[PDB]
Protein backbone atom coordinates (compact mmCIF):
# COMPACT_ATOMS: atom_id res chain seq x y z
CA UNK A 1 0.00 0.00 0.00
CA UNK A 2 1.97 2.94 1.38
CA UNK A 3 5.52 2.42 2.61
CA UNK A 4 4.97 4.53 5.71
CA UNK A 5 1.94 2.49 6.72
CA UNK A 6 3.68 -0.81 6.05
CA UNK A 7 6.48 0.35 8.35
CA UNK A 8 4.14 1.69 11.04
CA UNK A 9 2.47 -1.71 11.28
CA UNK A 10 5.83 -3.30 12.11
CA UNK A 11 6.60 -0.58 14.66
CA UNK A 12 3.35 -1.48 16.40
CA UNK A 13 4.44 -5.12 16.53
CA UNK A 14 7.77 -4.35 18.19
CA UNK A 15 5.96 -2.02 20.58
CA UNK A 16 3.50 -4.81 21.37
CA UNK A 17 6.19 -7.37 22.14
CA UNK A 18 7.98 -4.84 24.35
CA UNK A 19 4.97 -3.69 26.39
CA UNK A 20 1.94 -5.97 25.97
CA UNK A 21 4.06 -8.97 26.97
CA UNK A 22 4.02 -8.23 30.69
CA UNK A 23 3.03 -4.62 31.38
CA UNK A 24 -0.32 -4.67 29.56
CA UNK A 25 -1.12 -8.15 30.88
CA UNK A 26 -0.42 -7.99 34.62
CA UNK A 27 -2.83 -5.07 34.90
CA UNK A 28 -5.50 -7.25 33.28
CA UNK A 29 -4.75 -9.99 35.80
CA UNK A 30 -5.27 -7.40 38.54
CA UNK A 31 -8.65 -6.34 37.17
CA UNK A 32 -10.00 -9.88 36.63
CA UNK A 33 -10.71 -10.96 40.26
CA UNK A 34 -13.23 -8.76 42.07
CA UNK A 35 -11.38 -9.84 45.21
CA UNK A 36 -8.23 -8.10 43.96
CA UNK A 37 -8.18 -4.46 45.13
CA UNK A 38 -8.37 -2.71 41.74
CA UNK A 39 -10.00 0.57 42.77
CA UNK A 40 -7.20 2.02 44.90
CA UNK A 41 -4.56 0.23 42.81
CA UNK A 42 -5.48 2.31 39.73
CA UNK A 43 -4.43 -0.57 37.50
CA UNK A 44 -6.94 0.93 35.08
CA UNK A 45 -5.27 4.34 35.35
CA UNK A 46 -1.76 2.89 35.22
CA UNK A 47 -2.64 0.93 32.09
CA UNK A 48 -4.09 4.09 30.55
CA UNK A 49 -0.70 5.78 30.99
CA UNK A 50 0.80 3.12 28.72
CA UNK A 51 0.98 3.98 25.00
CA UNK A 52 -1.98 3.01 22.87
CA UNK A 53 0.40 1.17 20.54
CA UNK A 54 1.11 -1.30 23.34
CA UNK A 55 -2.41 -2.70 22.84
CA UNK A 56 -2.73 -5.43 20.20
CA UNK A 57 -6.22 -4.10 19.47
CA UNK A 58 -4.45 -1.57 17.24
CA UNK A 59 -2.75 -4.23 15.11
CA UNK A 60 -3.69 -5.06 11.52
CA UNK A 61 -2.87 -8.24 9.61
CA UNK A 62 -1.42 -6.96 6.36
CA UNK A 63 0.00 -8.89 3.44
CA UNK A 64 3.54 -9.87 4.35
CA UNK A 65 5.06 -8.30 1.23
CA UNK A 66 2.27 -6.51 -0.59
CA UNK A 67 0.96 -4.49 2.36
CA UNK A 68 -2.66 -5.22 1.39
CA UNK A 69 -4.83 -4.67 4.49
CA UNK A 70 -7.93 -6.57 3.31
CA UNK A 71 -8.59 -10.06 2.04
CA UNK A 72 -5.90 -11.47 4.32
CA UNK A 73 -5.38 -15.15 5.12
CA UNK A 74 -3.80 -16.17 8.41
CA UNK A 75 -2.44 -19.51 7.19
CA UNK A 76 -0.17 -17.84 4.63
CA UNK A 77 0.03 -14.24 5.80
CA UNK A 78 -0.77 -13.30 2.21
CA UNK A 79 -3.45 -11.38 0.36
CA UNK A 80 -6.09 -13.17 -1.68
CA UNK A 81 -4.50 -11.65 -4.78
CA UNK A 82 -1.04 -12.97 -3.94
CA UNK A 83 -2.17 -16.41 -2.76
CA UNK A 84 -3.92 -17.00 -6.08
CA UNK A 85 -0.81 -16.02 -8.03
CA UNK A 86 1.71 -18.08 -6.04
CA UNK A 87 -0.47 -21.17 -5.69
CA UNK A 88 -0.89 -21.15 -9.46
CA UNK A 89 2.90 -21.03 -9.83
CA UNK A 90 3.37 -23.91 -7.39
CA UNK A 91 5.06 -21.96 -4.62
CA UNK A 92 2.99 -23.00 -1.59
CA UNK A 93 3.60 -26.68 -0.84
CA UNK A 94 0.54 -28.90 -1.00
CA UNK A 95 -1.86 -26.36 -2.52
CA UNK A 96 -3.86 -26.88 -5.71
CA UNK A 97 -7.19 -26.10 -7.33
CA UNK A 98 -10.30 -27.80 -5.98
CA UNK A 99 -12.93 -30.14 -7.35
CA UNK A 100 -15.56 -32.18 -5.57
CA UNK B 1 -62.74 -8.34 37.00
CA UNK B 2 -61.58 -4.79 37.64
CA UNK B 3 -57.90 -5.24 38.52
CA UNK B 4 -56.05 -2.01 39.36
CA UNK B 5 -58.56 -0.18 37.20
CA UNK B 6 -58.02 -2.58 34.29
CA UNK B 7 -60.99 -4.49 32.90
CA UNK B 8 -59.75 -8.05 32.51
CA UNK B 9 -60.57 -10.06 29.38
CA UNK B 10 -63.85 -11.94 29.59
CA UNK B 11 -62.42 -15.47 29.25
CA UNK B 12 -58.65 -15.95 29.36
CA UNK B 13 -56.21 -18.09 31.26
CA UNK B 14 -54.90 -16.25 34.28
CA UNK B 15 -51.30 -15.39 33.42
CA UNK B 16 -52.13 -14.18 29.92
CA UNK B 17 -55.05 -12.15 31.24
CA UNK B 18 -52.68 -10.60 33.78
CA UNK B 19 -50.41 -9.68 30.88
CA UNK B 20 -53.09 -7.11 30.00
CA UNK B 21 -51.87 -5.06 32.97
CA UNK B 22 -49.61 -2.35 31.59
CA UNK B 23 -46.70 -3.28 33.85
CA UNK B 24 -46.84 -7.06 33.34
CA UNK B 25 -45.70 -9.32 30.53
CA UNK B 26 -45.52 -13.11 30.47
CA UNK B 27 -42.68 -13.64 32.95
CA UNK B 28 -44.08 -11.28 35.59
CA UNK B 29 -47.55 -12.81 35.45
CA UNK B 30 -46.14 -16.32 35.71
CA UNK B 31 -44.00 -15.57 38.74
CA UNK B 32 -46.65 -13.60 40.61
CA UNK B 33 -49.26 -16.30 39.97
CA UNK B 34 -46.81 -18.89 41.26
CA UNK B 35 -45.90 -16.80 44.30
CA UNK B 36 -49.34 -15.75 45.52
CA UNK B 37 -50.68 -19.19 44.66
CA UNK B 38 -53.75 -18.66 42.44
CA UNK B 39 -53.85 -21.30 39.73
CA UNK B 40 -52.28 -20.31 36.42
CA UNK B 41 -54.68 -21.74 33.80
CA UNK B 42 -58.08 -20.94 35.32
CA UNK B 43 -60.39 -18.71 33.28
CA UNK B 44 -61.14 -15.09 34.12
CA UNK B 45 -64.78 -15.60 35.12
CA UNK B 46 -63.82 -18.02 37.93
CA UNK B 47 -62.13 -15.44 40.16
CA UNK B 48 -63.58 -14.92 43.60
CA UNK B 49 -63.57 -11.54 45.30
CA UNK B 50 -60.82 -12.55 47.73
CA UNK B 51 -58.71 -13.63 44.76
CA UNK B 52 -59.09 -10.16 43.27
CA UNK B 53 -58.07 -8.71 46.65
CA UNK B 54 -54.94 -10.84 46.90
CA UNK B 55 -53.88 -9.94 43.36
CA UNK B 56 -54.58 -6.28 44.13
CA UNK B 57 -52.59 -6.02 47.34
CA UNK B 58 -49.71 -8.14 46.02
CA UNK B 59 -49.39 -6.08 42.83
CA UNK B 60 -49.61 -2.84 44.80
CA UNK B 61 -46.99 -4.18 47.18
CA UNK B 62 -44.13 -5.45 45.04
CA UNK B 63 -44.79 -4.05 41.57
CA UNK B 64 -45.43 -0.77 39.77
CA UNK B 65 -47.90 -0.68 36.87
CA UNK B 66 -50.50 1.42 35.05
CA UNK B 67 -50.32 5.19 35.57
CA UNK B 68 -47.27 5.34 37.80
CA UNK B 69 -45.18 3.34 35.33
CA UNK B 70 -46.37 5.48 32.42
CA UNK B 71 -45.61 8.75 34.17
CA UNK B 72 -42.24 7.48 35.38
CA UNK B 73 -41.31 6.47 31.83
CA UNK B 74 -42.46 9.87 30.58
CA UNK B 75 -40.39 11.58 33.27
CA UNK B 76 -37.35 9.53 32.28
CA UNK B 77 -37.73 10.49 28.62
CA UNK B 78 -38.26 14.15 29.48
CA UNK B 79 -35.27 14.29 31.82
CA UNK B 80 -33.18 12.65 29.11
CA UNK B 81 -34.45 15.38 26.77
CA UNK B 82 -33.73 18.40 28.97
CA UNK B 83 -30.08 17.58 29.74
CA UNK B 84 -29.24 18.03 26.06
CA UNK B 85 -27.75 14.57 25.62
CA UNK B 86 -27.61 12.90 22.22
CA UNK B 87 -30.67 10.79 23.00
CA UNK B 88 -32.29 14.04 24.09
CA UNK B 89 -32.36 15.73 20.71
CA UNK B 90 -32.91 12.34 19.09
CA UNK B 91 -36.16 12.19 21.04
CA UNK B 92 -36.88 15.82 20.20
CA UNK B 93 -36.82 15.26 16.43
CA UNK B 94 -38.43 11.82 16.40
CA UNK B 95 -35.49 9.79 15.12
CA UNK B 96 -34.13 6.43 16.33
CA UNK B 97 -31.97 6.78 19.43
CA UNK B 98 -30.00 3.50 19.51
CA UNK B 99 -27.76 4.07 16.51
CA UNK B 100 -30.10 2.54 13.95
CA UNK B 101 -29.51 3.36 10.31
CA UNK B 102 -31.55 6.31 9.06
CA UNK B 103 -30.52 6.39 5.39
CA UNK B 104 -33.34 4.03 4.37
CA UNK B 105 -35.20 2.43 7.28
CA UNK B 106 -36.54 3.83 10.57
CA UNK B 107 -40.09 4.41 9.44
CA UNK B 108 -41.30 3.49 12.94
CA UNK B 109 -39.78 6.65 14.39
CA UNK B 110 -40.29 8.64 11.19
CA UNK B 111 -43.95 7.62 11.04
CA UNK B 112 -45.72 6.95 7.75
CA UNK B 113 -43.88 7.79 4.56
CA UNK B 114 -44.27 11.32 3.23
CA UNK B 115 -43.58 12.47 -0.32
CA UNK B 116 -41.56 15.58 -1.17
Amino acid sequence: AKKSKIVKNEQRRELVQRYAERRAELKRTIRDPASSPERRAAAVSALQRLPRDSSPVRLRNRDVVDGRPRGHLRKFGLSRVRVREMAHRGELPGVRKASW
Amino acid sequence: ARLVGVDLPRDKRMEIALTYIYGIGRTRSNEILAATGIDKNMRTKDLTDDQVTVLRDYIEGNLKVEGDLRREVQADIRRKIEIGCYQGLRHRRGLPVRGQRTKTNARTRKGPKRTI
Binding site: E38, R39, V44, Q48 | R79, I83, C85
Partner: protein, 82 residues
Protein backbone atom coordinates in the same frame (compact mmCIF):
# COMPACT_ATOMS: atom_id res chain seq x y z
CA UNK C 1 -22.41 -0.10 28.98
CA UNK C 2 -19.12 -0.82 30.73
CA UNK C 3 -19.08 -3.71 33.18
CA UNK C 4 -19.38 -2.80 36.85
CA UNK C 5 -16.31 -4.72 38.02
CA UNK C 6 -13.98 -2.53 35.97
CA UNK C 7 -15.64 0.58 37.37
CA UNK C 8 -16.23 3.85 35.54
CA UNK C 9 -13.62 5.04 33.06
CA UNK C 10 -12.09 8.52 33.31
CA UNK C 11 -8.92 9.61 31.54
CA UNK C 12 -6.02 10.58 33.77
CA UNK C 13 -5.56 13.97 32.11
CA UNK C 14 -8.87 15.55 33.03
CA UNK C 15 -9.01 13.51 36.24
CA UNK C 16 -5.85 15.23 37.48
CA UNK C 17 -7.10 18.50 36.03
CA UNK C 18 -10.29 18.35 38.09
CA UNK C 19 -8.50 17.26 41.27
CA UNK C 20 -6.26 20.31 41.05
CA UNK C 21 -9.27 22.43 40.05
CA UNK C 22 -11.45 21.50 43.02
CA UNK C 23 -8.71 21.65 45.66
CA UNK C 24 -8.99 25.45 45.72
CA UNK C 25 -12.77 25.60 45.17
CA UNK C 26 -12.95 27.58 41.92
CA UNK C 27 -14.12 26.20 38.58
CA UNK C 28 -12.49 27.60 35.44
CA UNK C 29 -13.27 26.37 31.95
CA UNK C 30 -11.35 23.13 31.49
CA UNK C 31 -10.33 22.34 27.91
CA UNK C 32 -10.51 18.62 27.18
CA UNK C 33 -10.37 16.19 24.29
CA UNK C 34 -11.55 12.99 26.00
CA UNK C 35 -15.17 12.57 24.98
CA UNK C 36 -14.96 8.97 26.23
CA UNK C 37 -14.58 9.89 29.91
CA UNK C 38 -17.74 9.43 31.94
CA UNK C 39 -19.07 12.08 34.29
CA UNK C 40 -18.13 11.60 37.96
CA UNK C 41 -19.82 13.33 40.94
CA UNK C 42 -16.56 15.30 41.12
CA UNK C 43 -17.58 17.30 38.03
CA UNK C 44 -20.81 18.83 39.32
CA UNK C 45 -19.65 22.42 39.07
CA UNK C 46 -16.90 22.40 36.48
CA UNK C 47 -17.46 23.67 32.94
CA UNK C 48 -15.83 21.56 30.23
CA UNK C 49 -14.85 22.63 26.72
CA UNK C 50 -15.31 19.19 25.20
CA UNK C 51 -14.02 18.66 21.68
CA UNK C 52 -16.47 18.22 18.83
CA UNK C 53 -14.36 17.57 15.72
CA UNK C 54 -14.04 21.25 14.80
CA UNK C 55 -14.09 23.14 18.09
CA UNK C 56 -14.66 22.85 21.83
CA UNK C 57 -18.19 23.42 23.13
CA UNK C 58 -18.79 24.47 26.76
CA UNK C 59 -20.44 21.78 28.88
CA UNK C 60 -21.66 22.72 32.35
CA UNK C 61 -22.25 19.63 34.46
CA UNK C 62 -25.21 19.11 36.77
CA UNK C 63 -26.43 16.36 39.09
CA UNK C 64 -28.54 14.74 36.38
CA UNK C 65 -25.83 14.19 33.78
CA UNK C 66 -23.70 12.11 36.14
CA UNK C 67 -22.86 8.69 34.75
CA UNK C 68 -23.06 9.79 31.13
CA UNK C 69 -20.07 10.49 28.90
CA UNK C 70 -18.83 13.94 27.95
CA UNK C 71 -19.34 13.15 24.28
CA UNK C 72 -23.10 12.93 24.73
CA UNK C 73 -23.19 16.73 25.10
CA UNK C 74 -21.02 17.61 22.09
CA UNK C 75 -23.06 16.76 18.99
CA UNK C 76 -20.76 16.01 16.08
CA UNK C 77 -22.91 15.93 12.95
CA UNK C 78 -24.84 19.06 12.02
CA UNK C 79 -28.13 18.69 10.15
CA UNK C 80 -30.63 21.42 9.34
CA UNK C 81 -32.93 19.82 6.76
CA UNK C 82 -33.35 19.46 3.03
Amino acid sequence: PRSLKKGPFVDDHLLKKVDVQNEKNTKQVIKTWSRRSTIIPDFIGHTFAVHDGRKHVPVFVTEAMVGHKLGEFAPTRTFKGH
